[PDB]
Write a protein that binds this ligand. Structure first.
Ligand SMILES: CCCCCCCCCCCCCCCCCC(=O)OC[C@H](COP(=O)([O-])OCC(O)COP(=O)([O-])OC[C@@H](COC(=O)CCCCCCCCCCCCCCCCC)OC(=O)CCCCCCCCCCCCCCCCC)OC(=O)CCCCCCCCCCCCCCCCC
Ligand SMILES: CCCCCCCCCCCCCCCCCC(=O)OC[C@H](COP(=O)(O)OCCN)OC(=O)CCCCCCCCCCCCCCCCC
Ligand code: SF4
Ligand code: SF4
Ligand code: SF4
Ligand SMILES: [Zn+2]
Lengths: 133, 89, 89, 161, 186, 209, 49, 182, 118
């Protein structure tokens, strides 16, 4: 009866029908939310209590990805906030550590030249006698 | 690539002639760069005055079991669990 | 306002169909309890007392005895039924 | 029939959040242990257990409307698979199969082993021993179990786990 | 209301006990439904009513969860804030692992600290029970929040220490937050 | 006075003790021994031949009315000469009680089937034959129920290796799955979970010769 | 502020468990009576057509 | 492990594009096949039909993927019964020896192109019963496996993430583009 | 007359007083054939009298069930039909005799496999 007024609004922040369509084509949904924060890699995190619990907090993947978005691109900083483990975004909590050995996030790399492959981590135990010397 | 010949902190590496490197032609060999032996060595020792002190890993219930160390000897003393060093002067 | 629900007209229509006022199944942040809660202070046990708590009394494992032989333990010392009658009908 | 599967597995999904929230796994909690459960319930769980229970009656009514009185449902179940009472005992039957055919037997009442002593609830019984009444027993068991939670949530003491 | 064929004792509920009335007022009522699909009518009202509800679907992966801090997922070897690995090769985790999914070989390190030269978890044998993280006396091994690590090869599911250590660095921030918010219960 | 220790149910203990003796008089030919377990559960150790008689007596007698047969568990003990023991768990709805009947048999000697008394033992006996190799005479049709077709051996005997002798794999030459001698990538790592100090002194001198 | 998950002061409200049947609008006579009327009018309009 | 690009570095990277083959084909014939190869992959990617195997207690979590919370059907995934119409098989549970010939046959009857998903530890490597006398130590001993979903059971999202990996694996097949070189 | 037994597949009994009386009468005859010192003969003979007289003493089945307890009259018949089978079968087994099979050594020993020091 009055969802159009919401619908027009979604366009305005979207940037006109042209950017609205690309948003719909990408996220498969148009939703109103407040930008909670931005991670190191460009993903923008939104929140709106209007929606029900599961759909309450959502993420916009970085534009350059454009269709390779994965569930595994979420860095550990925001990971808890995104799965409702906490109600406190990383900006609003000071209990996060900043150790020097922490590593930047990475995808799950499978079927790729960058994948994992196991190997025994122990050098061989028995030494063979060398005849040459 | 570089990673194949890299030697891990545990001291293992496949010889350049060993066939087992074949597994890495289509994958990578992550060798961790944050070697614990060097990071703990970096942290300086803690000077104390009392004859015996305790280390619990630094965060009580989130650390390791509380162990007491005796500082009578000259050399700085290592904690069994965390590796931190203590010294009395 | 606070709930993303369909317009008033459809709510009446939906209410008519179900034959009963409807409570929305979907959970909303307001109904639930906050995901970051204060930390607990779980109570102790009955046997955290500091005295008169000898394990030799509290322990149950060392009190079990072997099976008792019914026929012999008389010799050394209404018809019967396995238990009490029940009306399973 | 398809819809009852989805209307109920939506509630089933909510229920396995409580498994996930206390044990850490949605299934195979590995929570109950010989000394009692392995951890205390998280703070604020019981409020959400209540919230689920308060709404679960409505969900079961809607499925009941579409299934219980459905003419087709009765025909697909009524007088199919009759279990006479004397047959059941000889077979090692138990549970709803035993109570489907009119036997008044429920281990919670006869040989109580937990707080079942401290709660009061009914037991559903069926007279015809067919699929249909056995189905009704399962639905009725879900009503009574929802009654037990009403007493557990209120009578829970504070103490060691 | 009709009567009950079998009188009911206390603490028992019957499902098919009421008999069928034979008054014309009731027979016609049953007849009308049996004759104009009356029972099925309300069944159709209910299903149509569900068209006018917000569906409960979640737009994964953009929206996902919810979970709890106790969630058991992929493994990771933590380390102290100094950077030193927490694990001291006590081997409690190996002994308790129900699936025998853990293999550890330990050796006196160069600096003389008890440490592992090997720590392998066979993720295709683990059951994600979580006994390993309960048994570790120094919280070295934890089941991290990650549950999205499906691979395209069986071999990639066998984690060695370097893989496990990498996870303990990629996921360090979130694990340290879960332990803090959960250790008191445990 | 002590909460951790479980409280014994004396009233249930009292009835089972007396009724335990009662069975001993009614069936002298078969009842070797009657004992009340520490769990306040009654066990009736019978001779191998007294299976069908004793089971019939408990099901039909007014006082017993153990109408419901719940289980038939098999236990293998290589130490004993009659290594295989068979345990029946019966339930009496009318009297609200449980009783256990145990019997012993060798690898070869058959054990009289009790399908007659309680024909709930149609499959339970089939399982016992399959798992342990105890044959049941007069069974309707004895046949493996759990293991694979043509599976050789009886897996649940203590003298059977945990992993079995043969694995399965698919062989694209033969266009079918084939069985090969077992070959495990990682052995089953034993753990020696043996305590060097006895903890339960009550059972040190138990069972005099 | 409780330090353990416990029922609130005074306890939760009673949880509905009983079965509530939906609204009934039609009886045998009203259903049979309406149909005849509807058919009769239907024939009446059919004749004019 | 290759870490993700930083925002500023990523702020310059061009938009990825849909096709994994890019629009850098030298000839018209190659380029048409590349685009035509996308059309196949778009088709097969869209509608992946599992077989409804459901062996063991992973099977329950294979129902909740079809439950309204996650709704496999949103992605074009539709359960089916006959292996002829089924395109993917989700071996979810402990494949015992007695089953093993039955899975092989059911897999064989599935028409190409067929992809297999391994759910849970049981089907991955024998899982909790790895050493049992009557368990096939992983279904890869019997049929080729294309995705391994770890867990016990895998979470519903975990399987969903697995399915999306299979879509991406399907998306990058080179069935046509490699015929040209052949 | 009970409208229904309440149990599926169990029919209401006509003249339960007669059917019980015959069955108890039959049992005492089968039991009589057993040796006097047999403990089973002493118990059922004592028992069946306690059931038999109550059947004749009471003429109202509802009163009969209270007087005997132990379930509905239909079940009372079902019970009685059994001890005929047991008593008849047991005249063949002769259980009152001495122990048929002397127990082997260590055949009921728990825990197993321990050295016994003479
Ligand atoms: C009904 C089916 C349509 C369903 C509705 C959605 C369709 C539109 C859409 O999704 O737009 C996405 C797209 C947004 O994505 P984008 O970020 O801009 O870049 C797209 C890819 O990333 C960049 O594309 P890419 O080249 O890297 O990968 C796609 C690949 C292959 O294209 C496909 O993926 C589709 C399947 C294969 C091609 C099918 C034709 C087969 C062979 C063609 C060669 C001969 O190449 C192309 O064909 C794209 C070139 C565009 C012309 C198509 C030829 O929308 C547009 O940019 C254009 C608007 C859509 C066209 C509307 C034209 C209306 C004309 C009225 C008639
Ligand atoms: C209903 C809607 C139907 C939609 C149909 C879309 C069809 C796209 C056609 C692409 C080919 C699909 C069939 C196929 O997979 O053929 C592949 C084949 C290469 O296979 P091959 O090299 O032999 O692999 C080794 C086997 N030992 O390829 C070849 O050997 C020859 C390839 C030559 C290029 C053929 C292009 C055909 C285009 C057909 C468009 C049809 C439109 C109407 C439908
Ligand atoms: S979660 Fe359980 S099964 Fe998995 S590695 Fe840890 S202890 Fe072993
Ligand atoms: S229990 Fe912890 S400290 Fe001990 S070996 Fe395992 S990971 Fe290392
Ligand atoms: S992997 Fe775990 S959840 Fe899946 S079937 Fe095996 S035991 Fe069950
Ligand atoms: Zn320390």
């Amino acid at each position: 009866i009055n969802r159009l007024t919401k619908l027009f609004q979604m366009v305005r922040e979207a940037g006109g029908l042209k950017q609205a369509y690309l948003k719909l084509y990408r996220n498969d949904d148009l939703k109103i939310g407040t930008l909670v924060g931005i991670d190191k890699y460009g993903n923008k995190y939104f929140e709106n209590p209007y929606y029900f619990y599961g759909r309450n907090r959502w993420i916009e993947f970085a534009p350059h990805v454009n269709m390779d978005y994965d569930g595994s691109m979420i860095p550990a900083e925001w990971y808890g906030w995104m799965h409702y483990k906490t109600d406190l975004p990383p900006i609003r909590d000071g209990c996060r550590p900043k150790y020097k050995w922490i590593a930047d996030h990475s995808e799950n790399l499978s079927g790729t030249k960058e994948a994992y492959y196991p190997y025994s981590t122990t050098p061989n135990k028995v030494e063979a006698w060398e005849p040459k010397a | 690539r570089g990673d194949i010949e890299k030697v891990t902190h545990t001291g293992q590496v496949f010889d350049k002639e060993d066939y087992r490197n074949a597994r890495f032609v289509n994958a990578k060999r992550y060798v961790n760069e944050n070697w614990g032996i060097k990071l703990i060595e970096e942290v300086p020792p803690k000077e104390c005055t009392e004859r015996v002190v305790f280390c619990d890993g630094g965060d009580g219930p989130l650390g390791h079991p509380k162990v007491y160390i005796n500082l009578d000897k000259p050399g700085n003393h290592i904690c069994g669990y965390c590796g931190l060093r203590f010294v009395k002067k | 306002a606070l709930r993303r629900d369909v317009s008033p007209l459809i709510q009446r229509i939906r209410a008519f169909l179900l034959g009963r006022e409807h409570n929305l199944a979907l959970r909303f942040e307001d109904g639930l309890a906050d995901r970051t809660q204060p930390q607990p202070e779980i109570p102790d046990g009955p046997s955290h007392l500091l005295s008169a708590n000898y394990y030799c009394q509290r322990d149950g494992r060392r009190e079990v005895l072997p099976p008792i032989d019914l026929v012999e333990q008389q010799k050394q010392l209404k018809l019967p039924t396995p238990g009490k009658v029940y009306a399973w009908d | 029939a398809l819809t009852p599967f989805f209307w109920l597995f939506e509630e089933r999904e909510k229920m396995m959040e409580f498994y996930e929230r206390v044990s850490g796994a949605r299934m195979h909690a590995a929570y109950i242990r010989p000394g009692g459960v392995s951890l205390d319930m998280p703070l604020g769980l019981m409020d959400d257990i209540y919230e689920f229970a308060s709404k679960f009656a409505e969900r079961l009514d809607e499925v009941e409307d579409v299934l219980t009185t459905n003419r087709i449902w009765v025909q697909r179940t009524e007088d199919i698979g009759i279990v006479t009472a004397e047959e059941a005992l000889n077979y090692g039957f138990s549970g709803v199969m035993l109570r489907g055919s009119g036997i008044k037997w429920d281990l919670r009442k006869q040989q109580p082993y937990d707080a079942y002593n401290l709660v009061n609830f009914d037991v559903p019984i069926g007279t015809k021993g067919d699929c249909y009444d056995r189905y009704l027993c399962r639905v009725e068991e879900m009503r009574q179990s929802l009654r037990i939670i009403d007493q557990c949530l209120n009578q829970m003491p504070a103490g060691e786990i | 209301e009709p009567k009950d064929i079998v009188e009911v004792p206390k603490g028992y509920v019957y499902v098919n006990n009421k008999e069928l009335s034979m008054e014309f007022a009731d027979i016609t009522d049953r007849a009308a439904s049996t004759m104009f699909f009356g029972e099925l009518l309300r069944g159709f009202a209910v299903t149509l009513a569900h068209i006018f509800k917000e569906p409960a679907t979640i737009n994964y992966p953009f929206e996902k969860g919810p979970l709890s801090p106790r969630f058991r997922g992929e493994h990771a070897l933590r380390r102290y804030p100094s950077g030193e690995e927490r694990c001291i090769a006590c081997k409690l985790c190996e002994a308790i692992c129900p699936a025998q999914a853990i293999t550890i070989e330990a050796e006196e390190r160069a600096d003389g600290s008890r440490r592992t030269t090997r720590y392998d978890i066979d993720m295709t044998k683990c059951i994600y029970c979580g006994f390993c993280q309960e048994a570790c006396p120094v919280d070295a091994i934890v089941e991290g929040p990650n549950f999205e690590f499906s691979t395209e090869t069986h071999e990639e599911l066998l984690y060695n220490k370097e893989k496990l250590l990498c996870n303990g660095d990629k996921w360090e921030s979130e694990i340290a937050s879960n332990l803090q918010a959960d250790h008191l219960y445990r | 006075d002590k909460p951790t220790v479980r409280q014994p149910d004396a009233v249930a203990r009292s009835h089972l003790s007396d009724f335990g003796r009662y069975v001993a008089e009614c069936l002298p030919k078969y009842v070797q021994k009657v004992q009340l377990t520490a769990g306040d559960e009654l066990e009736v150790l019978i001779a191998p031949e007294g299976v069908v008689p004793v089971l019939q007596f408990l099901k039909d007698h007014h006082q017993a009315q153990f109408t419901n047969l719940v289980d038939i568990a098999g236990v293998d003990v290589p130490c004993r000469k009659n290594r295989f023991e068979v345990v029946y768990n019966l339930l009496s709805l009318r009297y609200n009680s449980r009783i256990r009947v145990k019997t012993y048999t060798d690898e070869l000697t058959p054990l009289d089937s009790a399908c007659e008394v309680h024909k709930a033992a149609n499959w339970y006996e089939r399982e016992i034959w399959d798992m342990y190799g105890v044959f049941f005479a007069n069974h309707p049709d004895l046949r493996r129920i759990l293991t694979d077709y043509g599976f050789e051996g009886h897996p649940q005997r203590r003298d059977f290796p945990l992993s079995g002798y043969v694995e399965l794999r698919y062989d694209d030459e033969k266009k079918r799955v084939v069985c090969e001698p077992l070959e495990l990538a990682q052995e089953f790592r034993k753990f020696d979970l043996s305590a060097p100090w006895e903890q339960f002194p009550n059972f040190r001198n138990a069972n005099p010769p | 502020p409780p330090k353990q998950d416990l029922p609130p002061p005074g306890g939760y409200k009673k949880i509905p468990f009983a079965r509530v049947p939906p609204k009934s609008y039609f009886t045998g006579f009203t259903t049979i009576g309406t149909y005849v009327v509807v058919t009769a009018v239907g024939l009446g309009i059919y004749y004019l057509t | 492990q290759q870490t993700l690009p930083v925002a500023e570095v990523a702020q310059n990277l061009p938009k990825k594009g849909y096709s994994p083959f890019g629009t850098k084909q030298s000839s018209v014939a190659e380029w048409s096949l590349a685009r035509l190869d996308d059309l196949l992959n778009w088709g097969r990617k869209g509608s992946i039909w599992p077989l409804t195997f459901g062996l063991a207690c992973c099977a329950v979590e294979m129902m909740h993927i079809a439950a309204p919370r996650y709704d496999m059907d949103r992605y074009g995934v539709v359960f089916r019964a006959s292996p002829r119409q089924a395109d993917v098989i989700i071996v979810a549970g402990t494949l015992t020896n007695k089953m093993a010939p039955a899975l092989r046959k059911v897999y064989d009857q599935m028409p190409e192109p067929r992809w297999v998903i391994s759910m849970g530890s049981c089907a991955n490597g024998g899982g909790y019963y790895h050493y049992s006398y009557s368990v096939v130590r992983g279904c890869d001993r019997i049929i080729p496996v294309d995705i391994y979903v770890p867990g016990c059971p895998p979470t519903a999202e975990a399987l969903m993430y697995g399915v999306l990996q299979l879509q991406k694996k399907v998306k990058r097949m080179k069935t046509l583009q490699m015929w040209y070189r052949k | 007359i009970k409208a229904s037994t309440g149990l599926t597949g169990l029919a209401v009994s006509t003249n339960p007083h007669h059917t019980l009386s015959a069955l108890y009468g039959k049992i005492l005859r089968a039991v009589s054939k057993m040796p006097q010192d047999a403990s089973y003969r002493k118990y059922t003979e004592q028992l069946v009298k306690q059931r038999a007289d109550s059947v004749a003493q009471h003429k109202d089945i509802t009163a009969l069930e209270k007087a005997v307890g132990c379930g509905q009259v239909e079940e009372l018949i079902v019970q009685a039909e059994n001890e005929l089978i047991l008593a008849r079968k047991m005249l063949g087994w002769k259980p009152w005799e001495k122990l048929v099979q002397a127990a082997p050594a260590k055949q009921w020993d728990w825990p197993p496999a321990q050295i016994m020091e003479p």
